Amino acid sequence: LGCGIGRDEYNPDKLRYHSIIIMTDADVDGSHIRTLLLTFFYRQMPEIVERGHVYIAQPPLYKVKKG
């Protein structure tokens, strides 16, 4: 991410990407990992969430064929 941490050198103006996308698996463990990542992002880097640099992807789970 290249922003630092610890609020002593944590500068939110050095973010190397203006769009961060979370893309895990489509089952429940993906949901658990998503919750863990959201907890980390909210507790450690509030400004990134406030400015709107976090997104969520939605991959499919099933594929159906008939002919």
Place this chain on the structure above:
DNA sequence: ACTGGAGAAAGAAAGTGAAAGGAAGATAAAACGGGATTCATACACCGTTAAATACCGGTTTAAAAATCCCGTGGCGCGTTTTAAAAAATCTGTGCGGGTGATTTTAT
């Protein structure tokens, strides 16, 4: 001539691999101290007796005990410090289903 982009030089600040050495550990050789045997030899217990000591009666006298006056330092009180012990609060960890990953050899 002038402008602005771009590539190359040059210079300074940060990360790096290697460094005696020394306190901090670690590991062996040595000196020590505490049990099992083995007796010869000195020690414990029993009769006999001369002698050394305990005891009583009455002095005494010099020394120690008893008594009075006083002037202090050594205990007692109140109030603070300061370690020491106790109660309270954090830190790891393993049990069993789940998610995802690493390494060395032969031909």
